[PDB]
């Protein structure tokens, strides 16, 4: 907020929002995977399963 720094170091915390509204269609009872590839370090992925009834805000634990 003060400078323009965009490095992630001790004490900082950032959330990430991936928007797929019109371009990518996802619906109930489906399995999807989101893969993140940093320039260095681990390469992790996120596997979940869409619920059977979509609400405005859903939790996937």
């Amino acid at each position: 907020d003060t400078t323009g720094d965009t490095l992630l170091e001790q004490g900082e915390l950032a959330e990430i929002t991936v928007t797929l509204a019109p371009t990518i269609t996802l619906s109930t009872n489906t399995d999807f995977i989101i893969e993140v590839k940093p320039p260095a370090g681990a390469v992790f992925s996120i596997q979940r399963t869409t619920p059977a009834y979509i609400e405005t805000v859903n939790d996937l634990q």
Binding site: E35, K37, V43, S45
Partner: protein, 61 residues
Amino acid sequence: ITALETAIILIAFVVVASVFAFTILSAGTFSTERGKEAVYAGLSEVRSSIEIKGSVVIIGE
């Protein structure tokens, strides 16, 4: 008498020495250059690796 000839033989050997000196001068430079490239070439090869990041995906027709 003996002085006159020894001048001629003296000139003969110095010329041969100089010509041999020039050739051994010229050759030493070439050998030095070739040794230098070998080190440079060797270092470049070791550092040129490649990794694989992420999964492998098959697309079926």
